[PDB]
Amino acid sequence: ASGLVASNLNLKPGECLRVRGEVAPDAKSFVLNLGKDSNNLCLHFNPRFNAHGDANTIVCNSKDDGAWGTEQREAVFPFQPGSVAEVCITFDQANLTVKLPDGYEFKFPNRLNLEAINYMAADGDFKIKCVAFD
């Protein structure tokens, strides 16, 4: 019952990836992963409403050759269960820049040194409705 999975995205540095999806009404959290494949994620975007001991906190992390890196938590939380949320992601060799529904944007280190993002996957709590490449 997982979410949408996309491969061969070929997102290049500077390109803006816009993803709009519906957060499940009973979601305790949701995930949007970006990277080379399921075991190599340059970005594990994980807004947690009430999950894993956290409340209303965005947790980001990287996964390299299967290994999870050091998590980074964001300063804001412009998300709510049972609503449509859109995030905009771009990257360069040093960092990924993530823009949230509230227009707030932060950076997450590009720990995989990715020069292209070909994989994206959402979990069962984030129903992707639209994906744009600009």
Ligand X SMILES: CC(=O)N[C@@H]1[C@@H](O)[C@H](O[C@@H]2O[C@H](CO)[C@H](O)[C@H](O)[C@H]2O)[C@@H](CO)O[C@@H]1O
Instruction: Report how far apart the first and last C-alpha atoms of the chain are (Å, whole number).
Output: 29
The CA-atom distances, in angstroms, between 11 and each of 61, 130, 133 are 19, 16, 8
Q: Whose Cβ is closer to its own copies: residue 10's or residue 50's?
A: 10
Q: Is 69 helix (H, G, I), strand (E, B) or coil?
A: coil
The widest CA-to-CA distance across the chain, in whole angstroms, is: 37
Residue 44 binds which of ligand X, its own copies, none (CB < 5-8 A, kind-dependent): ligand X
Q: Which stretch binds its own copies (CB under 8 A): 7-15, 24-32, 41-49, 84-92?
A: 7-15
Residue 47 makes contact with its own copies by CB under 8 A = no
Q: Which stretch binds ligand X (CB under 6 A): 17-25, 52-60, 89-97, 114-122?
A: 52-60
Residue 73 makes contact with its own copies by CB under 8 A = no
